[PDB]
């Protein structure tokens, strides 16, 4: 199950995705097998979109932030005057 989105205004952004699924189903009727596989797809593609939408809106914001934070560990904009006239260590 592969998604792809691409935005190219003022610079690029791409969504690239896939989900591999292995499932075991049991055949019974034509009405049942028609409505059973669809049900598997429906739940998988919703769970996929749900995760693809809901995880990324929050978890990307936090993991993209774990790489570089929006403000520092102090939550104060770094003082440049402090950086240029302070010493650390021992």
């Amino acid at each position: 199950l592969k998604i792809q989105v691409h935005y190219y205004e003022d610079g690029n952004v791409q969504l690239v995705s896939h989900k591999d699924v292995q499932d075991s189903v049991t055949v019974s009727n034509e009405a049942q097998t028609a409505k059973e596989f669809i049900k598997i797809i429906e739940h998988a593609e919703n769970e996929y979109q749900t995760a693809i939408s809901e995880n990324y809106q929050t978890m990307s914001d936090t993991t993209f932030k774990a790489l570089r934070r929006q403000l520092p560990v102090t939550r104060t904009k770094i003082d440049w005057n402090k950086i240029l006239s302070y010493k650390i260590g021992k």
Binding site: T76, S85, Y86, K90
Partner: protein, 370 residues
Amino acid sequence: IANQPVVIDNGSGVIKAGFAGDQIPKYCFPNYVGRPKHVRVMAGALEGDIFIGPKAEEHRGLLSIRYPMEHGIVKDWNDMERIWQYVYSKEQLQTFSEEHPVLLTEAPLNPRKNRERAAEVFFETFNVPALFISMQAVLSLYATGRTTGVVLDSGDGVTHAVPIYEGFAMPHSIMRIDIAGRDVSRFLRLYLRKEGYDFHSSSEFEIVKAIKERACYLSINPQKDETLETEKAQYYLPDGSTIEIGPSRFRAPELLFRPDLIGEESEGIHEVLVFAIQKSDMDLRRTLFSNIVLSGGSTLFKGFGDRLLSEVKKLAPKDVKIRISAPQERLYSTWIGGSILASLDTFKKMWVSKKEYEEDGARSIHRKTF
């Protein structure tokens, strides 16, 4: 002019003084100005009529004592000038203010007008070559040797928790209360009147502080101690008369944890320590819980640290390693760090020089501190 600088660690209760690079503050005395109540008829009496330090401690009964400092905020400025003049005088330091640069200390989140008026005193009345004002929590970590960690303190004026992470004192997570040793001593005095023994005079107030220092313990479970009946332990005054203290000794230091007793809806020590860690960031919380440093005189109660551990266990998230470290010299922890900060060569960059103050003014002092 780069002489050996003086470190005046200001405090509401006690003031510490001495030179840079020393192990201990050699000159420690209580921060008040005693003045005589009675009339002096006979000649050969105590001259001057303004008593500071050991003379005032020796002759309490004569002197209508009044503290200039309240909650880390000086009210009486003329009295603090006389104290700072006494510090530099021949009776204590035996040096001039003109030679040595000055390291000063103050509590965080104080009035900026008081910080300016402090600088005005040191630069104009005294002729200081260079001044530097600093925090108490930053110095205490310099004294221990650590960089990261929370510093809970409890002096006579202020209880404030400041979280620091790798030499970065976090300003927006500074919690603070105006409940401290003096308020506990004032609350003990009020309790002793309910017991029977009143202490109304200002010289007579220091007996209540002496009772608070010696005979006060912090019980772990307050509801269990309230249900049980106390033993009523004795204490001898400077006069000689006995005092059965009773339940006032254990309910007195409860003020710091339960500030609802005095009639002032505040957080308390244990809540301040939790709130300081919670206001700081998710990644730093577990390191801040592991490194908790204690200082000040009002952390020296019996079973204080044990109670502060139990309160953290109640409030903080479960399955986290708690560690409330405490040095041997908690009263002098802030001064030791200042003496270490003064001894380092980078201290020359941080300070406010006299020339720079004359050019700019108060704005340069506000910039250099933060």
